Amino acid sequence: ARYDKYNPYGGGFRAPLAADWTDADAGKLYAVGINNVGAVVKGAGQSGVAGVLVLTKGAKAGSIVDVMKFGEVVEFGPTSGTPGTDFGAAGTAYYADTSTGAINSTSGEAKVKVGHTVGAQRLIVAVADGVVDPSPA
Amino acid sequence: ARYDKYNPYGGGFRAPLAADWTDADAGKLYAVGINNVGAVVKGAGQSGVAGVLVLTKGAKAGSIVDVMKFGEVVEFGPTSGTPGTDFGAAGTAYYADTSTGAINSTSGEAKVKVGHTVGAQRLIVAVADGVVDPSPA
Amino acid sequence: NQGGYNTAGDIKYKTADGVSYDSLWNLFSNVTDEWNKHKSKMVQLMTFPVTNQTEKVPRIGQFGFEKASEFGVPESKRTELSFYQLAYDFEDYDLAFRYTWKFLRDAPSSQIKAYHNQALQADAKLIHRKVMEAIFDNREREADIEGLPYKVYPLYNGDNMIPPEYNGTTFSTGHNHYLVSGGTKIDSADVEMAADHIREHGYTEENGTQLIAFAHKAEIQEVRRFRFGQTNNNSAVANYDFVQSQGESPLYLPNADGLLGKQPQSMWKGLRVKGSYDDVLWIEEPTMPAGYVLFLATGGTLAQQNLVGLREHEDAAWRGLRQIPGNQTRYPLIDSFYQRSFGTGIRQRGGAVVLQIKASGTYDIPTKWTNGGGFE
Amino acid sequence: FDNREREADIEGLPYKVYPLYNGDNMIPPEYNGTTFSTGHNHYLVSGGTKIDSADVEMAADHIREHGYTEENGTQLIAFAHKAEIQEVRRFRFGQTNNNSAVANYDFVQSQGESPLYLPNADGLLGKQPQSMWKGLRVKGSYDDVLWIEEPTMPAGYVLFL
Amino acid sequence: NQGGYNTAGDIKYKTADGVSYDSLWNLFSNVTDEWNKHKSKMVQLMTFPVTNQT
Question: Subunits with at least 3 CB pairs below 8 A relative to chain B?
């Protein structure tokens, strides 16, 4: 995954990273939130899911990251796939597990919608306010 | 509260103010909506909650206001607090009372999520489409 | 701080007694600030612009002759070399100035000029903080330079560097310059210990150095009471006596057996000197946190170069404080940026000592100079 | 000497007129990075029946924290009644005064005071205080403050200026 | 002392992190030890050249 189109004015925000992210995560996409200190963590923090994040390289705790709320992500595939080969399905909605921050096409009541795909490799990011269904039958 | 990132093209919109806002509201943040005439009111109008608003000085009815839907608000705190001293908690979601337009950290099924905080004094505004839970169990 | 867009509604025209705010802002539009001149002077005397060198190359082995013979031939001789280097950190920092079209129409020009003068003072505060936390934060830092990792250093901090041998004294691993006094108030044994921790690495008065101590008033008012053979705090006994600088308030000499020390001159490096104990000069330093003293070597053979290296960007187009034009423009919203980037590291890991006055336990980094803590 | 705030009218607009700092809500401006709260005060009580150098030392520094220091080219003056000067002139470095306080400075008498024997042939480190200031007569100095016997001064009071 | 023939493999680089091995050896090309200057002084104040072998 990579940021294709990012808008600094309300499309995303600067925040400090809460922990080190290793080069094993380089080019993966995760959903992220804010912890009680005001720093970025994978999954929901206290904020719920705040947005999505890609790092092109590993990064240290307390370094500044740009979290995307609205924009386009290219070379996209699910968080469990290999970056740059294991691309997504076309035309389908994508959902974050609020615990790990892992994104895949499987919907679930407790998950947060992050976007949908326009062709296999391009995700239109537009993160939901909250979970898919806060009142299951 | 103050605006710090605003985008005139889909981040917010011009609308006419339905009633005078006094200097007692100067620097407070309210959730706002549109009444059946087409003017900005506190809380939901007919539109539901349309966005959030801060005025830096009081303003007359029929004056034009920039309603925010996506952006960043700095010097932030809950609407009931004193502006410029009674700041928000870091890393937490914020919710509007649809009746009064007051914003605070307490979730509730009939409330609308307006954003989340990144550190104490910055709110990332990204207003939800509707109430937190339309169908309580 | 205060932040966000400047708006109509932030503009004040006149006071209730009819003074124009343009005239009030015109006091702040052009003045230099005496406190940020002092902070800028502390950077100037405590830093050097980074240049690339090896550390001191260790000396080769030496030969010896053999007793000759009429039939045989002698045994052969050889030697080898070694060297090393040290690195420096780097980081980017930026501020914003966002306005509305009404604000730039209606606001006084003096307010815009005041905001520019305040950005230059925000830079002085940033550089000063980053130099001081290079000294006072006792933690090793990683840095990436051209995609490779490097380690950049505080003073000796109990780590696995071994200081080089000097005059036949050999140091161990675990050598340290972040010292705890072991008592609630400073005493002469703390001062003599700390100055000797520097002077064991070279840096002595015979090598032509001066030691300086920068301290807060609460510790200077203890140190200036040290007198030879008298008891201090913590039952220490002073081996010297504090001699006032020639510019201090008058004092009676206590004895026909006069003071054991030379009288300091009025100023060192344009800073006023309180006096001297041992041979170190004591300076009342208003920037210094309460429980701490910085001892520093200067001059002579070994300390011609200041303690902290400043690294700026390798291209001149990216050096200095810069204004970037910003990407909201003319109407309805206007934006503009200031950007600076630089970083720091210590080469001479033994050239200074930080002493903390506390009763027991490990060293604490001063909160105002913890590396992650802020930008002032 | 009256530590109470007063109103005044100028062109029919009301204003406040002030004493020295007196526990009111003006915050003194920052100086050498020092930051002051509300409730700052310059009407001080000694906490002892006779003056001692800890009182003199605190009062002079309570001025000098605002600027007004010898580095900025000021002089400090103390106007006092002879009952307090007869204590102050006896202060000596490292020796004990009235309320068990130890003197952080000695009192050095001016030229034209009655002569004094000193332990050392050089005797004095630094410069002896001036005999006269502004046409008034100076007793000596303590912590670089000049001390002046001031017959208008009430008994239990010192003005540092 | 190290001893033996000088061999290829006692040489260990042309350059390392941009510094040259010839420049490193050039530092030591003309040094003199202050102890060997002192020892030469002590010999000079403590000896004479023998003209007469007995």
Answer: A, C
